[PDB]
Amino acid sequence: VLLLDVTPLSLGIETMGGVMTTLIAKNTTIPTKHSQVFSTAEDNQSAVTIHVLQGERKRAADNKSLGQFNLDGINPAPRGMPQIEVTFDIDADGILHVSAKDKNSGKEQKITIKASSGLNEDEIQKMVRDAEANAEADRKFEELVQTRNQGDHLLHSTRKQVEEAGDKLPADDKTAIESALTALETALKGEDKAAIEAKMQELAQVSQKLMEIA
């Protein structure tokens, strides 16, 4: 009332692309508890890595690591189907508890992080200045990661549809699409957004018939 325990920085986890996703926002009052359901990046994924982050930078690597931990025992499934509920709970005493539960398996790993873990009053002031200093670079990064994952999904999606299509697909139209997927997957290996979009553009244009079937 003359005083608040607040989170001086945001707390979250790394997600696909090397982006920090925020669970508890900067300048949140303690105690608190926020949960979010995540899934797998790839088919028959048997584990996820929960990499815990303190900071305001959109790039996982530019934020402060508080630890990591694995949740194994993910049963086979298509990617983006499993439910991994990640929850951050900070109690009154200043302790953070990150849990990851497979809502199928009922499996669960926790990690506990001392109130004293992370960046001292100084490193925090730098971190906030550096975030403002790089809202452009981080915008432009985020936009590319979005673009990549969109490309990635469109890649994996177009492969399923070709298998479930099979015989039903003109020889012609399959080749044209085998070429465009090979080109997209190569451009996803790069850092050039425009290049990714143009391979994505190429696939749309030559996929028209695969979509009807599908």
Provide, rounded to whole angstroms, the least separation between the CB of residue 62 and other proteins: 18
3-state secondary structure of 167: helix
Provide, rounded to whole angstroms, the least separation between the CB of residue 159 and other proteins: 17
DSSP state of 43: T
Chain position carrying tokens 């492969």: 159
Chain position carrying tokens 């432009």: 140
Report how far residue 103's alpha carbon sits from residue 157's, in angstroms, rounded to the nearest whole number. 25
* Cβ atoms 210, 165 nearer than 8 A: yes
End-to-end CA gap in the chain: 60
Size of the site for other proteins (CB under 8 A): 16
Provide, rounded to whole angstroms, the least separation between the CB of residue 94 and other proteins: 26
Report how far residue 189's alpha carbon sits from residue 90's, in angstroms, rounded to the nearest whole number. 38
Identity of the residue, 50 or 90, whose beta carbon is nearer to other proteins in the bound complex = 50
* φ/ψ (deg, to 5) at 96: -95, 135
- Footprint on residues 122-151 left by other proteins (CB under 8 A): 149
- Footprint on residues 5-64 left by other proteins (CB under 8 A): 13-16, 21, 38-41, 48-50
- Footprint on residues 168-207 left by other proteins (CB under 8 A): none
Q: Does 79 bind other proteins (CB under 8 A)?
A: yes
Identity of the residue, 57 or 148, whose beta carbon is nearer to other proteins in the bound complex = 148
Provide, rounded to whole angstroms, the least separation between the CB of residue 169 and other proteins: 28
Q: Which residues bind other proteins (CB under 8 A)?
A: 13-16, 21, 38-41, 48-50, 79-80, 84, 149
